[PDB]
Amino acid sequence: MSREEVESLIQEVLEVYPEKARKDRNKHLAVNDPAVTQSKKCIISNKKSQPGLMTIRGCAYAGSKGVVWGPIKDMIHISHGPVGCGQYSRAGRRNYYIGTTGVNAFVTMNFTSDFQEKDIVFGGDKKLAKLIDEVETLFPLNKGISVQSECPIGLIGDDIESVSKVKGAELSKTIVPVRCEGFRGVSQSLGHHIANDAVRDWVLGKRDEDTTFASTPYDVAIIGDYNIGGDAWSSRILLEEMGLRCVAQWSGDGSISEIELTPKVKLNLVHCYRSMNYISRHMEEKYGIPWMEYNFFGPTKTIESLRAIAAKFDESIQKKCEEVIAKYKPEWEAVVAKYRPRLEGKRVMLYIGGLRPRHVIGAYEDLGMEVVGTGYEFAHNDDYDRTMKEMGDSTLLYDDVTGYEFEEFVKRIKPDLIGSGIKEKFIFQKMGIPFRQMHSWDYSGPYHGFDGFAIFARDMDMTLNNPCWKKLQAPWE
Amino acid sequence: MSREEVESLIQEVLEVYPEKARKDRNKHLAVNDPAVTQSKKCIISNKKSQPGLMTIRGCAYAGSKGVVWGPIKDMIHISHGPVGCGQYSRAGRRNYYIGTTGVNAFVTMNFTSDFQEKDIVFGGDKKLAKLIDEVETLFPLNKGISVQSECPIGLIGDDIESVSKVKGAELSKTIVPVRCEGFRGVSQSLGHHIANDAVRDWVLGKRDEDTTFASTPYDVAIIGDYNIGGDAWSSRILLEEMGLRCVAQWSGDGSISEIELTPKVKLNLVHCYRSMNYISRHMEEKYGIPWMEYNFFGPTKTIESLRAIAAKFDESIQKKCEEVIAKYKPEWEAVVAKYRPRLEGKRVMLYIGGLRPRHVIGAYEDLGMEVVGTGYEFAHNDDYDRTMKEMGDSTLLYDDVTGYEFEEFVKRIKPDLIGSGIKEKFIFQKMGIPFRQMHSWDYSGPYHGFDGFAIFARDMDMTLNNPCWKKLQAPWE
Amino acid sequence: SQQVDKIKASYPLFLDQDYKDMLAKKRDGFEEKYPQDKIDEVFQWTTTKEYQELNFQREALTVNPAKACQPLGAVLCALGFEKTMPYVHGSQGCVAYFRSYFNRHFREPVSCVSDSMTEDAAVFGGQQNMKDGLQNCKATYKPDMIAVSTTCMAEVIGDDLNAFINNSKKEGFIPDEFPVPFAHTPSFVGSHVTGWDNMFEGIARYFTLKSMDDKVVGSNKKINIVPGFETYLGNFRVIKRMLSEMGVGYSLLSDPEEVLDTPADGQFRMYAGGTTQEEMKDAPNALNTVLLQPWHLEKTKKFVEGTWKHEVPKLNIPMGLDWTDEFLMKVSEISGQPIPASLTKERGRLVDMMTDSHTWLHGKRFALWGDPDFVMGLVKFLLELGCEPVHILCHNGNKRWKKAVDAILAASPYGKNATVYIGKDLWHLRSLVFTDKPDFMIGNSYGKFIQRDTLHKGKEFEVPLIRIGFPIFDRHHLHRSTTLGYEGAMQILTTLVNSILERLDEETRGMQATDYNHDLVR
Amino acid sequence: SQQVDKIKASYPLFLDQDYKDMLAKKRDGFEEKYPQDKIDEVFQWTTTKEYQELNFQREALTVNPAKACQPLGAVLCALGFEKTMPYVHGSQGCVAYFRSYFNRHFREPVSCVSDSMTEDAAVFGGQQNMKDGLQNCKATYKPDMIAVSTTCMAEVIGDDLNAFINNSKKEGFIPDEFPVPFAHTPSFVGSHVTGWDNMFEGIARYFTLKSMDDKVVGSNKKINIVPGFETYLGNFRVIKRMLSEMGVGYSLLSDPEEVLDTPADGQFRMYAGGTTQEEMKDAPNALNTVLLQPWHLEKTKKFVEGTWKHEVPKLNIPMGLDWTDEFLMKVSEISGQPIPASLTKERGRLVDMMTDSHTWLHGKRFALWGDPDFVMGLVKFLLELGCEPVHILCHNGNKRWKKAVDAILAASPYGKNATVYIGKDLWHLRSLVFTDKPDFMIGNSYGKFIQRDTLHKGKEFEVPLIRIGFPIFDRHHLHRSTTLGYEGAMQILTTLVNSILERLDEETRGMQATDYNHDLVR
Ligand code: ICS
Ligand code: ICS
Numbered sequence A, B: 001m002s003r004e005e006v007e008s009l010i011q012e013v014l015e016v017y018p019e020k021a022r023k024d025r026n027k028h029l030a031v032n033d034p035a036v037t038q039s040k041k042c043i044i045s046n047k048k049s050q051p052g053l054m055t056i057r058g059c060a061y062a063g064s065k066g067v068v069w070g071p072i073k074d075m076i077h078i079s080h081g082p083v084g085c086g087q088y089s090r091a092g093r094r095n096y097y098i099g100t101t102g103v104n105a106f107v108t109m110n111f112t113s114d115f116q117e118k119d120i121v122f123g124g125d126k127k128l129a130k131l132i133d134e135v136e137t138l139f140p141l142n143k144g145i146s147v148q149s150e151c152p153i154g155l156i157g158d159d160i161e162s163v164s165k166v167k168g169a170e171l172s173k174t175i176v177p178v179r180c181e182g183f184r185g186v187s188q189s190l191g192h193h194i195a196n197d198a199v200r201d202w203v204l205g206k207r208d209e210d211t212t213f214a215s216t217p218y219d220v221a222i223i224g225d226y227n228i229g230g231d232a233w234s235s236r237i238l239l240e241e242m243g244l245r246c247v248a249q250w251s252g253d254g255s256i257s258e259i260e261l262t263p264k265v266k267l268n269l270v271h272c273y274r275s276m277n278y279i280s281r282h283m284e285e286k287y288g289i290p291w292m293e294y295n296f297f298g299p300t301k302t303i304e305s306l307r308a309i310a311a312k313f314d315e316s317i318q319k320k321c322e323e324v325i326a327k328y329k330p331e332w333e334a335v336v337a338k339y340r341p342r343l344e345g346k347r348v349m350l351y352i353g354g355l356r357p358r359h360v361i362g363a364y365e366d367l368g369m370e371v372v373g374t375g376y377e378f379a380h381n382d383d384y385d386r387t388m389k390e391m392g393d394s395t396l397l398y399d400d401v402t403g404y405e406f407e408e409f410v411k412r413i414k415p416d417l418i419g420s421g422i423k424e425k426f427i428f429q430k431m432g433i434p435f436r437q438m439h440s441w442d443y444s445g446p447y448h449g450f451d452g453f454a455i456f457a458r459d460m461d462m463t464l465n466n467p468c469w470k471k472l473q474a475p476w477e
Numbered sequence C, D: 001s002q003q004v005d006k007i008k009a010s011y012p013l014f015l016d017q018d019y020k021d022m023l024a025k026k027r028d029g030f031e032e033k034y035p036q037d038k039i040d041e042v043f044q045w046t047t048t049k050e051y052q053e054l055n056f057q058r059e060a061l062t063v064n065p066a067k068a069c070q071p072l073g074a075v076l077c078a079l080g081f082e083k084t085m086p087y088v089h090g091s092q093g094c095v096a097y098f099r100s101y102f103n104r105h106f107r108e109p110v111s112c113v114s115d116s117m118t119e120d121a122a123v124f125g126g127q128q129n130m131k132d133g134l135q136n137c138k139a140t141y142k143p144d145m146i147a148v149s150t151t152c153m154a155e156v157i158g159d160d161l162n163a164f165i166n167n168s169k170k171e172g173f174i175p176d177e178f179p180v181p182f183a184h185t186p187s188f189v190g191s192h193v194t195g196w197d198n199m200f201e202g203i204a205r206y207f208t209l210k211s212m213d214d215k216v217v218g219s220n221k222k223i224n225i226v227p228g229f230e231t232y233l234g235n236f237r238v239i240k241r242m243l244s245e246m247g248v249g250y251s252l253l254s255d256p257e258e259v260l261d262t263p264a265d266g267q268f269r270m271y272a273g274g275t276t277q278e279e280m281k282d283a284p285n286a287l288n289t290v291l292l293q294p295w296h297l298e299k300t301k302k303f304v305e306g307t308w309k310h311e312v313p314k315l316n317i318p319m320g321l322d323w324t325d326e327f328l329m330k331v332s333e334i335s336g337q338p339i340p341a342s343l344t345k346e347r348g349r350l351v352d353m354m355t356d357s358h359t360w361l362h363g364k365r366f367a368l369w370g371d372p373d374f375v376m377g378l379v380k381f382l383l384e385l386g387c388e389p390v391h392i393l394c395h396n397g398n399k400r401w402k403k404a405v406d407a408i409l410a411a412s413p414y415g416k417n418a419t420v421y422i423g424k425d426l427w428h429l430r431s432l433v434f435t436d437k438p439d440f441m442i443g444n445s446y447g448k449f450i451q452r453d454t455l456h457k458g459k460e461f462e463v464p465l466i467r468i469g470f471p472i473f474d475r476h477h478l479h480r481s482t483t484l485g486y487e488g489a490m491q492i493l494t495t496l497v498n499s500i501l502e503r504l505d506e507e508t509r510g511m512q513a514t515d516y517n518h519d520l521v522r
């Protein structure tokens, strides 16, 4: 579509809104223009959602418990508040780990204080302190406890910081209070930030005097890869065939000890800029550790990343970088050869969280596909800055898109593929439009790295070219 | 019920028949009279079935292939004829074995010459000889072959005796021709006899030219136990705890070599008199091996049998016999104390093949139960002689009962339990009458021996006292 | 030994140490068994391409067939008629087998009689058997009709069914107007489905051949439906449902769904429901006749076109999405009824399930067997699911059928690795699932023994059975299922995707080894 | 690495040697993991009676609950009304979870909105959110009705739903006529089923409280049916089907079956079907009102009796044989319609299945959980099948409920080894299946992790999961099945007996070791 066509599509769709909602949403919808590279001249982001419009957004608790803390595999995370939050988010996110669950690892378990109205009235601080002793009795090999606050906690005046310090001292245990109540902020994003501050304040500085770890010139950490379907492992393998030593993973398959050793590394490698640029900035200012963004989606971005990372080190790493790139060359080539013809020229619309809506574009282009629309739930203007660079001229950009809008946009633009979430999936299947889940990877993946590109390609093909899509129209109407 | 009530039930039922069928069937239905102990004065048996009356009987092929030869585990049995017989009898009988199926044992496989019309027109002997070669190629560890003739083989004039001599001599292999065509005889029974003579003539004479076996005074053979659900194993364990050595089991879990060793034994133990009294008589005639009938159903009979057998040997065996009886006393007494109260006073009607209709009476009596009706598909009058001794005064006896008779008898007598076959089971369930399969043991068992009695009791209880029986009446009618 | 409070049946009883020792002694002492290494060596060999080539050279030997004989199908057909007693002329051993075979699949009574021909009949033929048999049967079981077929004994002997039945009526053994349709059903020709075809033509001929003069095509405004050999109650029931929803007048010719599903309410009902004699007499007056399984209704088809003058539409079995569409559209054409909102919605609900499940189904490889029309509908539906039907085996299939299925395969990219086999048995298939391992088998209970063999080579080689077909003896009540129409497509899809997910859960259940992928959500 | 012809996903990709070595390097290098012997030792301890005793002393800690929070239930109830948008007053995070939770179980869209209250609303309350929320929701999604519930944030700050909605009407954000029923649904009270009861009584009040004057009991000759929290499509459908077969006029109040099962035909339908407003307005004119799940409809019952003046019959959930009988008999009493032949036959078919399958089912031991009505109906049916429901867990159960279930156990010899647990969670249940091992679990997808745990102790300790309840996330389309009435009893029986036979087949699949009992026929 042309710019002008996209712009009247926007105006047309917004005609249904009450005046106040219309004026607001108008600022969150834009057509990409190569001449403009300042997103702040182009689209508004990180604002509250307008009421009643069926935003796709979650909350700060989801951003903190579900995203950052939850994956840490050898700590127990307490969902502190009523039963829902901890239950709806039990094992919903595929942050993969190696461990013996219920014994030394606890990721897919749901620990909760299961607030009752008595706890609303008298407060929950005694219950929490009792909860911790019980956790200690029943799960002895836990290496730390986090307290993920749900909505009521701040609202009733509870002091989890005090309980965490007292119980922490008494049991010689790392107990981390997290103020990620769902009313905080406007989205998952503030939950990331709160979560980062919590790691910093309660965990990260524990080994500041400790010096028994043996460092090497090639020590790195993977920052903001949560190992969705194994994404971090299929990334890690590449960094170590390149001769680097991956000291930590934040936080997919991550242990509290890895996290504590992170200030010892030479370089932080940030995949998810949105969720952990905060701690990366901290680690830069306090330990002198530089950080860089990278992208392991598709062979093009993966080769670029590997080379940029290798350039931070000596010739021996740069040489091994070329060795890795030569090793995997025939594998991803086989993938392109097989699947690019089956996908080329197909048009994709994306709607995801705070990173993948721009980060997977190169992978789609490596298969000859075109991303004609993209958007985020909770990104900031620095994300949209980066996005306008990756996205095509005249493409549609939507921030905190509403259900109605996403539906109307799709109906007009008619992409060949939509990539979004579980709340979106079953809608567009009904419309007869191929859909891939781009959070959970539709229970497939990894999609990171070379091994992941083979699966990504397989997955876009099996769904875009499936015989089911021919069938939606009955022959007799 | 009284004798005269039963006698008038019989006449009433026979009222529906055309004259010829009424006159014949009247001869096969009788009320036991303790004063008469010659069955030939009160019931006729082993005659043809009246056409169109829905007999429960099978044929000579079922008696040879299904019953006697099929369980021999390390031989391959060819169902020689069209595809039916071989398929409907594939693994329908639970003659249990230890072996590696398809490799060194073959019991639940279906090997067939699958006659086409060309095989009728030109004869099947060339196909048979070609089939034997293919069997040899694909199943090299078989130790012998038998050829079970289906109806068309004799009718078209094939010569399987000749193919067996020739191919046998050519391949240095035991190849046994069995003329068990279902048009022969009037039932399975003639199939037993044909199959027994096949063993005499083609198998049994083979280690008359061999003495490198080491005999002991306590060598026996279990004759006519087809190890249904393990029945023979749970008999054999007792015989060997008594100090005896069981050289052969005929033919449940039977190998050809142990069958060939049988003429070396000191005593032939016959469980199923009907199916293998022929070969037992022959071994006695040719080798001087004595044979005796026994009964391992229920503690009373099992104990009686062990003592009767032990009495054939010396005092050591007689001493170990009492040690066996002392060992299992607490176990079968525990079973009685649990289940006899739950079952005492209940009335059972039985209809089975050639042995069980009399042989299981004692076990029912060991649980306080009463067999008020029993009968056989294909028994001879020497079976009925033994029956009149096991059954109570004024009980109903029926030979080759019709579907109609059996149903009408049950409706009038109203037993608490019926024990019969699969063709009967679902009929009487619909009538609200507890049914137990007394061929297949309803996929349970073993029922032989002390360990079998425990399972037997468990099974009669679970069905007789099941909650489902109370529910057949809709509360509203 | 038993503990009274924990009684052990054969499994696990015989795993007790004293039994294990006893079995070892039996083996070592008297069985002259091959050594275990030799057994392992020969088993290994039977899994090889070399073994497969020898196996496929068989001409004379058949091993583990996937078919039964004609009169079994005649019996099932006969059961579909009101108060009708299946009667197989010949020897009684067969009839015991037909009955127990169907007893075990349906867990229902199966009524059928023999006239008990013996050796003596080879001199004098079975005529007296027939006379006394029909008289005895009619008096004792009070059918309204007796439908006669044959065992191979009778066929080889040469008994003239038509003469014997005419002489029975002539000599007064049964009333002349009492319906006794018949068919020769030789077990050494075709298979159980051919017997079904033969018996149905026999019954159709009996009620219409001499009465055609007053017949007018279309005059009763109905469509005849012939189901063929059908062992899922849900299939009879879904066809009647769909036609009723459409407002289509129909006559299901051979309808055993009632007599194969009588209530347990205190009384045994030998007969229930079924196609009436009046429905068969009046069938030539239908608009047309539709054959649900054309590839084993060829004889019937010729009679229906040649005698009733119906123009039998060329339809595939209504399985899967496309072929159910086509069935509903041809029926709409013939009857003049539109396809209703209810069926349209049901179709879209099936298609929705296909989009929900396509990512787990995609590319999954199957070995399958069964009767020709069943197998081709299953092949067809599998292709619509994005699955790959690698080994397609139809033991009673033929060259023309194979071509039609090969055509269906070539029309789809999911057909590219698929091969159709006819005249091959389950011992051939066993080799194929070793040498060219698929993900699952779809087949009847005989397939459990192939799954056992594959597991024996190793867990990574195991090919799990999914039970769809006939006979199913080792699970309960699957005979109540549906495989035809959208309903059956829904049921089959669900069984397939959940068998895949069951198996994935098993392979990822290993704590700390494979349970990184033991997802709560799939 | 990948081979392009056979691409590996996470499983089995990460089993490759190079990934395996990498994972061992990560562990050994940087994870400071407890030694494997210590892990094994603590695992072993968590299976013990000693551990169980500590577990059961928990007061403050809950682990792996088996319940969710009120508003979830309010949304499901709301969806059952015609063109009705569920609307949760409070924070948006909750609505993301509610939607995804149901998305994953039904594999359907699930429409719900939030009015996105934020931190700021703690100073001034959520009145402006409600005004803009309703206006925006009505204009954009065009519902005929908005049904309002609350998140715990809204409940803790004390927003007055009634006043807020009234003010929204008063200041002209939504028409005065536009229906906005509401209910307070605090998540720190009760559970998800309580939310359903609250929402429903909210909606019933809205349409009937002010209009009772002209109502006459029985004047419309119908029976209202209230289904409660219900996540099986088959259950709504079997109720409607049985009553239609009976010729019984009925009104099902909250009926989401269409909107949870729209066709994929090329368009998205936000709304479909559902209880009409007219049906709710008219409901006091019914003969009576029947509650399908009484143990979580107590508020609704007080309203129905207190205001409509209906005399709610004392009926258990219509599960299994006896309670389905009782349901039909009471409906017959109320309606005057006799129980039809079709239902009596269906009943006799269920009873036939029970006689068919009883020898495999007898004495089988089960651990099970779920909501109170579902659990007691499962218990009752298990007892009817001659099974032993050993561990009965209802996290959201109460004392009175537990006494009634205990009464049901006492009346059956099959209840002798049964214990009912209330307020206990799946981590408690995990202990019980270790210390007092049953044969199977019956429960939702969370139970898969207990099965994993038992397997880790040993294959002989493994307790397999049988999926029946909510949520079921790891199998496809189970939400289409049925658990109520003779039909659901048939489905449940079939699932139970065949899980038993699958498991036996696995335990006897070992060649030469245990396959002596690998029977073709069962
Ligand atoms: S953390 Fe973030 S919404 Fe960066 S909250 Fe969300 S596992 Fe998304 S686009 Mo779910 S900022 Fe990760 C994300 Fe991206 S949960 Fe996952 S897919 S790369
Ligand atoms: S052989 Fe006979 S019909 Fe003696 S043909 Fe039959 S495994 Fe019966 S009463 Mo099936 S003379 Fe055995 C018998 Fe008895 S097959 Fe079994 S149960 S003790």
Ligand SMILES: [Fe+3]
Binding pocket: B426, C106, C107, C108, D352, D353, D356
């Ligand atoms: Fe039955």
Ligand SMILES: [Fe+3]
Binding pocket: A426, C352, C353, C356, D106, D107, D108
């Ligand atoms: Fe769906």
